[PDB]
Amino acid sequence: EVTVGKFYATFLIQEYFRKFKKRKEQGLV
Amino acid sequence: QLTEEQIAEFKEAFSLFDKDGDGTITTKELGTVMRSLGQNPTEAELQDMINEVDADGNGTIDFPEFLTMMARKMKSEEEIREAFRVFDKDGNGYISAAELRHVMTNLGEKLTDEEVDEMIREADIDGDGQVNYEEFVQMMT
Ligand SMILES: [Ca+2]
Ligand SMILES: [Ca+2]
Ligand SMILES: [Ca+2]
Ligand SMILES: [Ca+2]
Ligand code: NI
Protein backbone atom coordinates (compact mmCIF):
# COMPACT_ATOMS: atom_id res chain seq x y z
CA GLU A 1 0.00 0.00 0.00
CA VAL A 2 0.96 3.58 -0.73
CA THR A 3 -1.63 4.05 2.04
CA VAL A 4 0.95 2.86 4.62
CA GLY A 5 3.55 5.04 2.83
CA LYS A 6 2.23 8.16 4.58
CA PHE A 7 3.08 6.67 7.98
CA TYR A 8 6.51 5.60 6.79
CA ALA A 9 7.20 9.01 5.21
CA THR A 10 6.73 10.61 8.65
CA PHE A 11 9.09 8.08 10.24
CA LEU A 12 11.53 9.08 7.51
CA ILE A 13 11.06 12.80 8.30
CA GLN A 14 11.84 12.02 12.00
CA GLU A 15 14.72 9.84 10.97
CA TYR A 16 16.19 12.82 9.08
CA PHE A 17 16.35 14.78 12.38
CA ARG A 18 17.47 11.90 14.63
CA LYS A 19 20.43 11.02 12.36
CA PHE A 20 21.65 14.64 12.51
CA LYS A 21 21.32 14.94 16.30
CA LYS A 22 23.38 11.74 16.80
CA ARG A 23 26.13 13.00 14.47
CA LYS A 24 26.34 16.35 16.34
CA GLU A 25 26.61 14.54 19.70
CA GLN A 26 29.35 12.08 18.63
CA GLY A 27 31.31 14.73 16.68
CA LEU A 28 30.73 13.25 13.21
CA VAL A 29 28.90 16.06 11.33
CA GLN B 1 17.64 -8.37 12.26
CA LEU B 2 14.80 -6.16 13.65
CA THR B 3 16.79 -4.62 16.45
CA GLU B 4 15.74 -3.28 19.86
CA GLU B 5 16.94 0.15 18.66
CA GLN B 6 14.92 -0.09 15.45
CA ILE B 7 11.80 -1.01 17.48
CA ALA B 8 12.61 1.97 19.74
CA GLU B 9 12.78 4.28 16.73
CA PHE B 10 9.43 2.99 15.46
CA LYS B 11 7.96 3.57 18.95
CA GLU B 12 9.12 7.18 18.58
CA ALA B 13 7.20 7.42 15.27
CA PHE B 14 4.18 5.85 16.99
CA SER B 15 4.41 8.47 19.80
CA LEU B 16 4.21 11.28 17.25
CA PHE B 17 0.81 10.01 16.06
CA ASP B 18 -0.35 8.94 19.53
CA LYS B 19 -0.47 12.53 20.77
CA ASP B 20 -2.30 11.77 24.03
CA GLY B 21 0.07 8.92 24.91
CA ASP B 22 -2.77 6.51 25.56
CA GLY B 23 -1.26 3.68 23.48
CA THR B 24 -3.54 3.84 20.41
CA ILE B 25 -3.70 6.02 17.28
CA THR B 26 -7.14 7.34 16.35
CA THR B 27 -8.43 8.86 13.08
CA LYS B 28 -8.53 12.24 14.84
CA GLU B 29 -4.87 11.89 16.00
CA LEU B 30 -3.75 10.82 12.53
CA GLY B 31 -5.61 13.77 10.94
CA THR B 32 -3.89 16.11 13.42
CA VAL B 33 -0.40 14.97 12.50
CA MET B 34 -1.06 15.00 8.74
CA ARG B 35 -2.60 18.49 8.87
CA SER B 36 0.30 19.74 11.04
CA LEU B 37 2.63 18.64 8.20
CA GLY B 38 0.57 20.63 5.65
CA GLN B 39 -1.32 17.60 4.29
CA ASN B 40 -5.12 17.47 4.10
CA PRO B 41 -6.69 13.97 4.17
CA THR B 42 -10.47 13.45 4.23
CA GLU B 43 -12.44 11.57 6.90
CA ALA B 44 -12.52 8.63 4.44
CA GLU B 45 -8.78 8.84 3.67
CA LEU B 46 -7.94 8.78 7.40
CA GLN B 47 -10.30 5.85 8.09
CA ASP B 48 -8.76 3.68 5.36
CA MET B 49 -5.30 4.53 6.74
CA ILE B 50 -6.52 3.25 10.11
CA ASN B 51 -8.27 0.28 8.43
CA GLU B 52 -5.09 -0.76 6.67
CA VAL B 53 -3.03 -1.01 9.85
CA ASP B 54 -5.63 -1.93 12.47
CA ALA B 55 -5.35 -5.71 12.36
CA ASP B 56 -7.70 -6.57 15.23
CA GLY B 57 -10.40 -4.30 13.80
CA ASN B 58 -11.22 -2.38 16.99
CA GLY B 59 -11.02 0.95 15.11
CA THR B 60 -7.57 2.09 16.33
CA ILE B 61 -3.86 1.36 15.92
CA ASP B 62 -1.88 -0.02 18.88
CA PHE B 63 1.93 -0.28 18.83
CA PRO B 64 2.09 -3.98 17.74
CA GLU B 65 -0.09 -3.13 14.69
CA PHE B 66 2.08 -0.10 13.94
CA LEU B 67 5.29 -2.14 14.37
CA THR B 68 3.96 -4.88 12.00
CA MET B 69 3.34 -2.35 9.24
CA MET B 70 6.56 -0.43 9.85
CA ALA B 71 8.88 -3.44 10.03
CA ARG B 72 7.31 -4.77 6.80
CA LYS B 73 7.77 -1.41 5.03
CA MET B 74 11.43 -1.27 6.14
CA LYS B 75 11.85 -4.22 3.74
CA SER B 76 11.43 3.05 -0.92
CA GLU B 77 11.82 5.99 -3.36
CA GLU B 78 8.16 6.88 -3.05
CA GLU B 79 8.18 7.26 0.75
CA ILE B 80 11.41 9.32 0.68
CA ARG B 81 9.92 11.42 -2.14
CA GLU B 82 6.82 12.09 -0.02
CA ALA B 83 9.07 12.99 2.94
CA PHE B 84 10.96 15.49 0.75
CA ARG B 85 7.72 17.06 -0.45
CA VAL B 86 6.54 17.49 3.10
CA PHE B 87 9.61 19.69 3.78
CA ASP B 88 9.51 21.36 0.35
CA LYS B 89 6.08 22.83 0.74
CA ASP B 90 6.36 25.56 -1.92
CA GLY B 91 7.32 22.82 -4.41
CA ASN B 92 10.32 24.69 -5.76
CA GLY B 93 12.59 21.64 -5.38
CA TYR B 94 14.76 23.09 -2.57
CA ILE B 95 14.30 22.78 1.18
CA SER B 96 15.00 26.19 2.78
CA ALA B 97 15.86 26.94 6.45
CA ALA B 98 12.27 28.20 6.91
CA GLU B 99 10.87 24.91 5.50
CA LEU B 100 13.07 22.92 7.83
CA ARG B 101 11.93 25.02 10.79
CA HIS B 102 8.40 24.46 9.72
CA VAL B 103 8.64 20.65 9.81
CA MET B 104 10.88 20.68 12.92
CA THR B 105 8.37 22.59 15.00
CA ASN B 106 5.52 20.35 13.92
CA LEU B 107 7.59 17.29 14.85
CA GLY B 108 8.22 18.62 18.35
CA GLU B 109 11.89 19.15 17.55
CA LYS B 110 13.50 22.28 18.96
CA LEU B 111 16.72 23.17 17.18
CA THR B 112 18.54 26.54 17.22
CA ASP B 113 19.05 28.49 13.99
CA GLU B 114 22.73 27.54 14.22
CA GLU B 115 21.72 23.80 14.29
CA VAL B 116 19.34 24.30 11.37
CA ASP B 117 22.25 25.83 9.35
CA GLU B 118 24.54 22.95 10.47
CA MET B 119 21.92 20.51 9.14
CA ILE B 120 21.83 22.32 5.84
CA ARG B 121 25.63 22.62 5.50
CA GLU B 122 26.15 18.92 6.12
CA ALA B 123 23.70 18.02 3.33
CA ASP B 124 24.42 20.88 0.94
CA ILE B 125 26.57 19.27 -1.78
CA ASP B 126 26.16 22.07 -4.39
CA GLY B 127 26.73 24.93 -1.97
CA ASP B 128 23.47 26.86 -2.69
CA GLY B 129 22.46 26.96 1.00
CA GLN B 130 19.36 24.76 0.56
CA VAL B 131 18.72 21.01 0.26
CA ASN B 132 17.59 19.69 -3.13
CA TYR B 133 16.08 16.18 -3.68
CA GLU B 134 19.44 14.54 -4.55
CA GLU B 135 21.09 15.96 -1.39
CA PHE B 136 18.11 14.99 0.77
CA VAL B 137 18.24 11.38 -0.43
CA GLN B 138 22.02 11.30 0.10
CA MET B 139 21.64 12.46 3.69
CA MET B 140 18.90 9.85 4.26
CA THR B 141 20.75 7.08 2.43
CA1 LIG C 1 -4.01 8.15 21.33
CA1 LIG D 1 -6.21 -2.15 16.94
CA1 LIG E 1 11.06 24.90 -1.09
CA1 LIG F 1 22.09 22.42 -2.15
NI1 NI G 1 2.08 24.91 8.93
Method by which the model was determined: X-ray
User: How many other β-carbons are positioned within 10 Å of the β-carbon of residue B107?
Assistant: 17
B11 lies in the same domain as B72: yes
Contact B69, A3 (CB under 8 A): no
B69 lies in the same domain as B101: no
Contact B94, B79 (CB under 8 A): no
| Distance from the alpha carbon of residue B85 to the mean position of ligand 5, in angstroms | 13
| B41 burial type by CB count under 10 A (0-12 exposed, 13-18 middle, 19+ buried) | middle
| Residues of chain A positioned with their CB less than 8 A from the CB of B122 | 20, 23, 29
Q: Which domain holds residue B41?
A: 3-76
Overall domain count for chain B: 2
Query: Domain holding B69: CATH number?
Result: 1.10.238.10
| Residues of chain A positioned with their CB less than 8 A from the CB of B139 | 16, 19
Using DSSP's 3-state secondary structure scheme, residue B41 falls into coil
B57 lies in the same domain as B100: no
> A28 CA to chain B: closest CA distance, Å?
10
State the resolution, in angstroms.
2.0
Residue ranges in chain B assigned as alpha helix (H): 4-17, 27-36, 43-53, 63-73, 77-87, 97-107, 113-123, 133-140
B129 lies in the same domain as B94: yes
How open is the CA angle B65-B80-B74, to the nearest 5 degrees? Answer: 35
Using DSSP's 3-state secondary structure scheme, residue B139 falls into helix
What does DSSP say about strands B61-62 and B24-25: parallel, antiparallel, or unpaired?
A: antiparallel
B98 lies in the same domain as B125: yes
B86 lies in the same domain as B44: no
Round to whole Å and give the CA distance between B62 and B50: 10
Contact A7, B49 (CB under 8 A): yes
A28 contact B CB<8A: no
Contact B139, B122 (CB under 8 A): yes
B70 lies in the same domain as B28: yes
